[PDB]
């Protein structure tokens, strides 16, 4: 019966609407733009308050791995979907589960404030502008799905004399089409996934392209092992077990091996200076091809930028530059929340399970999609929303404010705790762990041990095979029937789209390639 306000109709938004309908609540979803998707909807223009995309973007997480747990991608969809097709997939999810009804478009959420009675009612005043007409309205609970990656980050201090530059420059955000660097001399600043992608793209046309890193980065292909989507090999329960039950110094060294096995990162000048602190690995299939053919060349860091030129640290050659692209990442904020509710300190909101603000008397505000997992946002946001709406409904319950506030402070001090691939800093989180924590909380986590006795086929395909989101809706509330069939047909769909030419499962694979061989008994 509870009335839920959903802020934004992005991936996270749609999941909330769906998860609301599903647990029989009344969702009202306020989108500020004129259609759903947020990011995944490519427009020509940059809309403010709404994440922006370049025309060439394709998913850096694979098809059967980054779909809503109860809604696979079509069979005819490529293993890594372009922004065009990703949007269609979202408009399909929206159509299917009848979500379009509940969305009000061109509706900025100007403010969400506790009701005066909140301490007893647990309600919210949601002020919403539409055709320049403010309109207050009371809601029983609010789910915020603004995500991040809309607010650009561009620290001009950090690039001395960029003011003096007489060429043109801009943030990745403002980038749409590669025409603009036809024959120009291009410097892409920051080896962000966006950076690398643009640099590579520029190389197609531009006379010269330089990609200025700072730390450097590890770089891997979508293609990965045997033409298998990397994630369908890497993000599997079994592997995730190995990594997490194995000392940081090893796994990090062990990764460098599996990253260099493509190309010696040292020779290409990508090698991160600081090992043992593995930043998000870059996902680009072209880069090396560009470096070896000299269409893109990695440069160490901007030392200073001149009238019509740039100088890099430890780099004697001053390089003439026409265009500078700052792929320097994005910040995030909540203008409609007050500081009393959500903090936004050090790229982090201080939320219990990166959702609930963990001091509020009543748990009736949820933040969906403010997390940086080791896997796709799509299922995380959804699996987030499942455990969320059931707190708002009161079917599940948060532990005491005393337990949440102190547990949050443990993750907030970014304490490495060694062993498992140290989870960086801000919104750090293992994909499988965080999902299993939440599936537990709503009693959807399948009993794998039991599974093995009852159904052994499925049991193994879930542990050794790719941790596909289907295996979330296998048992518990929201259980999907097709789930089992979907999990076992996993690879059949993954190969139908690549195998466009005939000739005359794929359980585990070769991630732990010099590992399972190296760490097998020395029987004395
Ligand atoms: C180039 C690129 C590629 C990516 N590829 C992948 C990928 O392959 N796989 C993956 O899992 N993730 C990927 N991501 C991450 C991406 O953030 C998610 O995939 C997805 O876009 C999450 O959507 P969201 O709901 O969190 O937020 P968004 O997509 O940003 O949607 C937020 C929505 O909220 C609306 N809004 C904002 N403020 C207000 C307000 N005050 N009132 C009302 N509405 C408001 C906006 O208009 C927008 O529609 C990628 C990101 C980028 C930039
Ligand atoms: N499909 C794709 O391939 C694709 C494309 C774009 C975006 N994405 C998604 O979007 C997310 C974030 O996108 P993004 O790449 O724009 O952000 P990002 O990955 O955070 O990139 C920002 C980069 O800018 C550099 N940087 C940051 N602060 C700096 C400073 N003060 N001075 C100099 N350099 C600085 C860093 O690289 P250096 O350390 O190298 O300088 C950093 O990695 C990704 O994780 C991914 O999910 C995916
Ligand atoms: C195979 C050798 C394992 C050596 C383990 C010794 C190192 C311990 C360091 C801390 C890491 C945690 O260690 C780990 O805990 C639990 C056991 O309760 C198991 O973890 C498991 O949890 C759930 C079941 O509840 C599974 O869905 C998940 O896929 C799996 O990771 C791992 O098999 C074990 O390795
Ligand atoms: Cl452009």
Residue numbers in the entry: 2 to 505, 512 to 531
Sentences from the paper on this structure:
We were able to successfully crystallize AncFMO1 and to solve its structure at 3.0 Å resolution. The asymmetric unit consisted of two dimers, and the dimerization observed for AncFMO1 is the same as for the dimers documented by the other AncFMO crystal structures. Alongside the well-conserved NAD(P)H- and FAD-binding domains, known as the paired Rossmann fold, AncFMO1 includes a large 80-residue insertion, two small α-helical triads that form the hydrophobic ridge that embeds into the phospholipid bilayer, and a large transmembrane C-terminal helix that drills into the membrane. The oxidized coenzyme, NADP+, was successfully bound in the crystal structure and two glycerol molecules were found located near/at the active site. AncFMO1 possesses a phenylalanine and a leucine at positions 149 and 150, respectively, creating a hydrophobic and wider pocket at the base of the active site. Furthermore, with Leu150 not being able to create hydrogen bonds, Lys373 is not tied down and can extend outward, toward a glycerol molecule situated below the diphosphate moiety of the NADP+, thereby further enlarging the active site. While the other AncFMOs crystal structures portray the 2’-phosphate to be extended out into the solvent, in the AncFMO1 crystal structure, the 2’-phosphate is tucked inside the NADP+ binding domain. More specifically, the 2’-phosphate establishes hydrogen bonds with the side chains of Arg280 and Thr214, and the peptide of Met192. Nonetheless, unlike the other characterized crystal structures that conveyed closed active-site cavities, AncFMO1 exhibits a significantly porous active site. First, the residue changes at the base of the active site (Leu150, Phe149, and Lys373,) create a hole in the vestibule and a leaky cavity. This is in turn emphasized by a large loop (residues 416–425) that further expands the substrate entry point.
